[PDB]
Amino acid sequence: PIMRVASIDIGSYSVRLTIAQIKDGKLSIILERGRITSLGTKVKETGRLQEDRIEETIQVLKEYKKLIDEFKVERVKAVATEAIRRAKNAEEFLERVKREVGLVVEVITPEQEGRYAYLAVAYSLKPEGEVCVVDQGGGSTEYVFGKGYKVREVISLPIGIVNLTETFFKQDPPTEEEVKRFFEFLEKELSKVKKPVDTIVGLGGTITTLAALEYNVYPYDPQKVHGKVLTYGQIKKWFDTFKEIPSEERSKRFRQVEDRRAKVILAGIGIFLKTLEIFEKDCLIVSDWGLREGVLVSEVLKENHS
Ligand SMILES: [Ca+2]
Ligand SMILES: [Cl-]
Ligand SMILES: [Cl-]
Ligand SMILES: [Cl-]
User: Fold this and answer.
1) In angstroms, what is the C-alpha Rg of the chain?
2) What values do phi and psi take at 96, rounded to 5?
3) Are residues 186 and 300 in the same domain?
């Protein structure tokens, strides 16, 4: 019989709901919602989640729970990112969610996010041989190694593209020397995760935007992007293109680039370019699915155990 499953992901910017049906082993997404609640507001400065952001987040979660109830979702898993954990009143916020929404939200590590993203790829792409999933987003890039559905090792590198951009790219766009320093740093960090692999799979907003650009996909359509290959050469040419374009012009020239990602996209592209160089691989496969969908996969595997 068909079963419905759902995931909720609470980040520093948005709270997101994904509902899927599973029918003869096939997962199809049937509902998605997203609301920006900016839970990370002033956490760096005050060490705390702000009350107005908590209250809005609780109201969104109530609305998501109403949908889960009406849609008769049988399995629900809710997670929060380590950026929420950074806050000092996170535990008190999560207790309110238990009491007022009826939902447990698990604070998960970046490594665990990687483990879920890896499951998404295992299901949605079935990559062969020794696999490394490279998941860039939310302040980090995870490198998740395994074979089939089995994760062997996950390494999370805290090389967030906002920080890399601010650190290295003092000009907009950066000078050639700034680009050089950025790559020297990435060589230092990425050489530590290098392992022999058969297949690299790339995830996140940077790489799916790159795939849409390379393959002339507009508007964005996951069916046209998921499973596309990008070679080192293709990624290098996009890096070289964006390094010559001021950030404010990028979304004007290339419509698929979101305004809010336009400045940091170059750093993102560099992570993937240097990754391919260091791992000595000529290409990667793009996934449209990651954490949010991997939580759904995990729920299906749990249902089928025993
Ligand atoms: Ca990440
Ligand atoms: Cl960052
Ligand atoms: Cl990032
Ligand atoms: Cl991104």
Assistant:
1) 19
2) -60, -40
3) yes
**Residue span of the structural domain in which 105 resides:** 1-125
Ligand nearest the Cα of residue 136 is 1
Ligand 4 centroid – CA 190 distance (Å): 19
Experimental method: X-ray
Resolution given for this structure, in angstroms: 1.5
Closest CA to 292 of 169, 121, 141, 174: 121
Q: According to the annotation, is 34 in a ligand binding site? A: no
Q: Name every residue whose Cβ is closer than 8 Å to that of residue 164 and which is 6 or more positions away in sequence.
A: 182, 185, 264, 267, 270, 271
**Domain shared by 277 and 140, yes or no:** yes
Give the end of a domain, one of 125, 157, 172.
Answer: 125
What 3-state class would DSSP assign to 86?
coil
The domain total for the chain is: 2
Same-domain pairing of 105 and 229: no
Question: Distance, CA 304 to ligand 2 centroid (Å)?
Answer: 38
Same-domain pairing of 96 and 232 = no
137 labelled ligand-binding: yes
Q: How far is the CA of 251 from the centre of ligand 2 (A)?
A: 21
Confirm if 96 and 10 have CB atoms less than 8 A apart. Answer: no
